[PDB]
Design a binder for this molecule. Structure first.
Ligand SMILES: [K+]
Ligand SMILES: [K+]
Ligand SMILES: [K+]
Ligand SMILES: [Mg+2]
Ligand SMILES: [Mg+2]
Ligand SMILES: [Mg+2]
Ligand SMILES: [Mg+2]
Ligand SMILES: [Mg+2]
Ligand SMILES: [Mg+2]
Ligand SMILES: [Mg+2]
Ligand SMILES: [Mg+2]
Ligand SMILES: [Mg+2]
Lengths: 130, 134, 161
RNA sequence: UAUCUAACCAGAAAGCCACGGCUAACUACGUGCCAGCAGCCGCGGUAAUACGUAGGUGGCAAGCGUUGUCCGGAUUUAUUGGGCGUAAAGCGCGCGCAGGCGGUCUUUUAAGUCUGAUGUGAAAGCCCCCGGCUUAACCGGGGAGGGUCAUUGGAAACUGGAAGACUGGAGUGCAGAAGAGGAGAGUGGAAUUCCACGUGUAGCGGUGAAAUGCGUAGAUAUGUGGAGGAACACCAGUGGCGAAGGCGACUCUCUGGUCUGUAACUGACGCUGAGGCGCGAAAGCGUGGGGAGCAAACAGGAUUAGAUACCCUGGUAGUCCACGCCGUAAACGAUGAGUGCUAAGUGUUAGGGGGUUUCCGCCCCUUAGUGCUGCAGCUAACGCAUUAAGCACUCCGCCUGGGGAGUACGACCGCAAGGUUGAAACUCAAAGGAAUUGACGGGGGCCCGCACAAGCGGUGGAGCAUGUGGUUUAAUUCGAAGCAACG
RNA sequence: AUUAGCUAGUUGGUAGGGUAAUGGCCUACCAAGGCAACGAUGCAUAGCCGACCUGAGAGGGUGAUCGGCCACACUGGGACU
């Protein structure tokens, strides 16, 4: 197993593929953070959290433009268990010169690259989003 | 590979071979032990001189000399150009270069450096084959 | 789109290519040709004929029908991208103004005839120009404008900025 | 000495490489696979832009070229940045120490991370800005950069440490189900051979033909009875089980693992797994039995040009057992173990749940397997496709052009045969995979032609005419040479 | 790693002497540790750096000249000043 967040990003990719409308996955705090962040950024039609016997579950409603266009082209993980990536406020690079976005988990909470710049922090590059 | 694999053993590149191994070895009589030194050219003494039948596709006879270099390595050197001065116990200077026609030759004789007297009658590319200007 | 413009075609490779029979070889020529207008549009075509110009013109005729657009943002592509068709692996990075386009012939031709003035590139995969060009167009299909992405997300260009 | 003034003189001051492509720049002669050229591909066998020379051209220029070495191009050691079905590449498979990696939540820290301050990282050199040498090179001035740098002070999001709690992972319990899973002991009848006895008369066997061989000292066959061993038809099926090798007649004993359902119990106890340990087809080795068939080797007979072979007749090792070694395989799904996610259709196996119905029977849903066909997606393609070769993460093993070479030295193991680990020198410019078009095929299929077959009449034999060959000739003009030269 | 064990003043301690000065630096006595798959031990190689060449950069190679540090003056050892 060894990766909740990667499972999350890959399920979102695999639902981008088939153009499913929703995708339900077991939840955790970090998953909810990243769902929040994608909702802030404009990748998710809506997200809602659900209670269950075990651990709580999360459901993402996916966002497509007109003509069934995708808004997520690609997700990716960077900091991984076998190798993590820790970057500074100066070493976080602008995804696609600022078209896409990245996630950097820092002391000020979980953030994007741009928010982490605004706060002049750094930390784990958890993911890119084309 | 995994990163843990790459840490347990880093990468290892390829072991490069030289076109010219014998130019890349010196000698000292004292130690009687070869000493790696990159060299462009070496001088030697022709043990043997002769002709060769080259590979398919070709059939012309190719002039070679079996030389004992300064460093003791015995080497077959092509004798480029029309005619030559050389014979047994003739001193010769040697540069690198591979005769693709001929199997066992990897080096050339610089023409005009030592007892290798320049080519006869040549007018073009004279700096090669070692004729003065007339 | 279509065959409705004045354009600036360029021939990339012309490969003589051989079908073989009891009576030996029946040579033919293939022509891969890139059409564009430097105000922004480009497309590639292929053609086959026993003759150089016949292949060239068939290629032009396929090109004018199989075209696409590329964004030309500030003399550059808007962002970095990669194309991956077959054994084609070709990345495109923007560059500084006045640097000029930087690429091999079969990709250089694509970007020039689109009219993109300042881009870096590198052939990573195979060297076969057909697959190279399929890689280029697979890439510049992925390219996106800031306004388009904002329209998708619900943002503003000054907010992505 | 620089520097500066005058006077005199175009007068004394240009050479090297290449010109087939790669790559800028073509003609003539001479040569004739010779002489010679060549960084790769490659030129030269009587019409050479590829050799030598002359002219002309191209590139450079007081230097040009060759050689040697370093980086790049080379993503060809891929952290950035590769891969292992078929191309090189998944240990044959497991048990597992170490290590790597690790489900959800709260508190605590600050080992890692991030962050403000101070200090330093010399000058020269790279970089930027100015100035000076007739500019340039060069030189000066100033600034900047550069550290997994250190101390000190802050944050707790993530990793890590700590103290708790929970259950979808993992496991135990509980109720069921299948099974050629393994070891031991015993047991059954077909059926090959052999022994005896009747009946019984001249063949049997085998081949493309035969022959060697067995047989009147009596077979071949036929029946009865007995001995001996080896394997187990039907069932039996892209069906079951097993980590793999592999496991098929039956019964008993001793044992392993799997799946289904429950949510009872523990509460991350887990995944991988270098180095070790064991298992591990068939062949083979040691000791002692057994040995019916089959059968390497071998003998004889055929075949053949020859046949140290296919083929026939015989036949030793072996094959079988006990014990112990050997530890290889086209050991293959040529596809590492684990987890999750991403359309379908349909068989088949072992289960469970529910609707209907008298059970039966049909239907649908679901779990673990096993197979067929296929969407996305991947792939060089062939093709893989919820049993991925897809999308992602952890871990291990392995590859880096062909050959030499799985060789040599060395070490370990082995009674030995040999195995495991594993190079270089040298050589090549390719090696190779998939697929396309043909051609071919002592591959298939369909159709045709005096192609055969069915027939008629001929040639080859004799004599002559003609042509050709060889030869002999002063010359025996030249040309034609399988069909397609030879009145 | 086609080199896995190494060490025996070797590791620590109590006393003592010694150096410009701490310390097994050395001596005596006591205990038997210590290092090491985070590669010790051993073999071959090499002066180290600023920096130089290359490269998109990561990195690759080098350690001429210039500056800093180290080491050595035919080889070995030893002291005096
Ligand atoms: K035996
Ligand atoms: K098998
Ligand atoms: K000591
Ligand atoms: Mg000629
Ligand atoms: Mg292979
Ligand atoms: Mg400095
Ligand atoms: Mg056996
Ligand atoms: Mg007939
Ligand atoms: Mg006749
Ligand atoms: Mg005649
Ligand atoms: Mg030295
Ligand atoms: Mg590079």
């Amino acid at each position: 197993m060894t990766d909740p967040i990667a499972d999350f990003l890959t399920r979102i990719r695999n639902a981008n593929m088939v153009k499913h409308d929703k995708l339900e996955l077991p939840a955790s705090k970090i998953k909810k953070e990243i769902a929040e962040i994608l909702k802030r950024e404009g990748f998710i039609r809506d997200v809602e959290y659900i209670e269950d016997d075990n651990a709580g579950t999360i459901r993402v409603f996916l966002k497509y433009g007109a003509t069934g266009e995708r808004v997520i082209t690609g997700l990716k993980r960077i900091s991984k268990p076998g190798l993590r990536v820790y970057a500074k406020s100066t070493e976080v690079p602008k995804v696609l010169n600022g078209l896409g976005i990245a996630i950097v988990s820092t002391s000020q909470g979980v953030l994007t690259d741009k928010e982490a710049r605004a706060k002049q922090v750094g930390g784990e590059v958890l993911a890119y989003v084309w | 590979p995994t990163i843990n694999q790459l840490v347990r053993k880093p990468r290892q590149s390829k072991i490069k071979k030289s076109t010219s191994p014998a130019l890349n070895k010196g000698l000292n009589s004292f130690k009687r032990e070869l000493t790696d030194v990159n060299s462009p050219q070496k001088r030697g003494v022709c043990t043997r001189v002769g002709t060769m039948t080259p590979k398919k596709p070709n059939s012309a006879l190719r002039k070679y000399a079996r030389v004992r270099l300064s460093n003791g390595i015995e080497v077959t050197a092509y004798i480029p150009g029309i005619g030559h001065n050389l014979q047994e116990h003739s001193v010769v200077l040697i540069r690198g270069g591979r005769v693709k026609d001929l199997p066992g030759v990897r080096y050339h004789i610089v023409r005009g450096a030592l007892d290798t007297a320049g080519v006869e009658n040549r007018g073009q590319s004279r700096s090669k084959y070692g004729t003065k200007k007339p | 789109d279509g065959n409705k413009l004045d354009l600036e075609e360029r021939v990339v490779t012309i490969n003589r290519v051989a079908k073989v029979v009891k009576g030996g070889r029946r040579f033919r020529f293939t022509a891969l040709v890139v059409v564009g207008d430097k105000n922004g549009h480009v497309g590639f075509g292929t053609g086959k004929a026993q003759e150089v110009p016949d292949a060239i013109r068939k290629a032009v005729e396929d090109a004018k029908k199989n075209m696409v657009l590329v964004p030309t943002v500030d003399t550059t592509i808007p962002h970095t991208v990669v194309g991956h068709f077959g054994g084609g692996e070709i990345l495109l990075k923007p560059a500084s103004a006045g640097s000029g386009v930087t690429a091999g012939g079969p990709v250089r031709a694509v970007l020039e005839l689109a009219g993109v003035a300042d881009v870096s590139s590198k052939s990573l995969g195979s060297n076969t120009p057909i697959n190279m060009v399929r890689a280029t167009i697979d890439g510049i299909k992925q390219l996106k404008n800031a306004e388009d992405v904002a329209k998708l997300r619900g943002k503003t260009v000054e907010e992505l900025l």
